[PDB]
């Protein structure tokens, strides 16, 4: 994560890592939304342009890790996938629209001290929180700049939401309601941004209402990283809230 802090032990306990089975490889980021399901960016699992077309057995995940320059035994876990679920209308052709996907674990991780599931937005919240100016927290182990740059500890960072017209223009990609964008503007005081390898990671907010963390977006994409005049886009988790259940109810 470009221009951002270093995490506090057990800060984003719903953090997940997406691994290529063999060869064991770091691919993307993810969020734990219960003891059986994991959210994520659709493109991590399916992106024909970089010839990417994974199936349950190509990957595995690690939950509750803080540092890679170590291995916290009895702390971190490593589940296996029992089935991936990419959004039907996911548009990898034009604009990575609906870029979202759920993954079922073969066996349900147990919530520990450092492993807890994040909450999903309810019409009520999303309507009130997801406003321009409010802030959310982006987490990942992605690049630390734009070009290697690989961190050893989970990078956090907090970015305000931008108005739709600014994003709608800051890019030449047609952005839908399944996406929003955050980051500081040109001349704002601070900077920060997600970057390659962050995709599919969470973007929580803390409800001033019930005082809980709610993943509102999923890192989807961006032009370069942190470049002034440019804002990172996220999947509007609530929008596709619907889909997310039709998938869990069923199994």
């Amino acid at each position: 994560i470009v221009e951002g802090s270093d995490a506090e032990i057990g800060m984003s306990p719903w953090q997940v890592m997406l691994f290529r089975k063999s060869p064991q490889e770091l691919l993307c980021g993810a969020s734990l939304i219960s003891d059986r399901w994991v959210l994520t960016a659709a493109h991590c699992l399916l992106y024909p342009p970089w010839d990417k077309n994974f199936t349950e057995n190509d990957l595995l995940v690690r939950i509750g890790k803080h540092s890679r320059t170590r291995y916290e035994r009895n702390i971190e876990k490593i589940s296996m996938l029992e089935k991936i679920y990419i959004h039907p209308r996911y548009n990898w052709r034009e604009n990575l629209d609906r870029n979202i996907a759920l993954m079922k674990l073969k066996k349900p991780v147990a919530f520990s001290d450092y492993i807890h599931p994040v909450c999903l937005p309810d019409r009520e919240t999303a309507a009130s929180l997801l406003q321009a100016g409010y802030k959310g927290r982006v987490t990942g182990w992605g690049n630390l700049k734009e070009t290697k740059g690989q961190p050893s500890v989970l990078q956090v960072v907090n970015l305000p939401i931008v108005e739709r017209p600014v994003c709608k223009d800051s890019t030449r990609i047609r952005i839908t309601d399944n996406m929003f964008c955050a980051g500081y503007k040109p001349d704002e005081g601070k900077r920060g941004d997600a970057c390659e390898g962050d995709s599919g990671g969470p973007f929580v907010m803390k409800s001033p209402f019930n005082n809980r963390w709610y993943q509102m977006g999923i890192v989807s994409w961006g032009e370069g990283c942190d470049r002034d005049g440019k804002y990172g886009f996220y999947t509007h988790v609530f929008r596709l809230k619907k889909w997310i259940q039709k998938v869990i109810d069923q199994f």
Binding site: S5, M11, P13, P117, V118, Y134, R137, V204, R212
Partner: peptide, 29 residues
């Protein structure tokens, strides 16, 4: 809602992480 989004080593221990106020502040600001 069950028990989601409440960080054990924080909201359960009445501990704020070193950054949240910034957010809790961007509602007023």
């Amino acid at each position: 809602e069950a028990d989601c989004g409440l960080r054990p080593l924080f909201e359960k221990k009445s501990l704020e992480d070193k950054t949240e106020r910034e957010l809790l502040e961007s509602y007023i600001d």
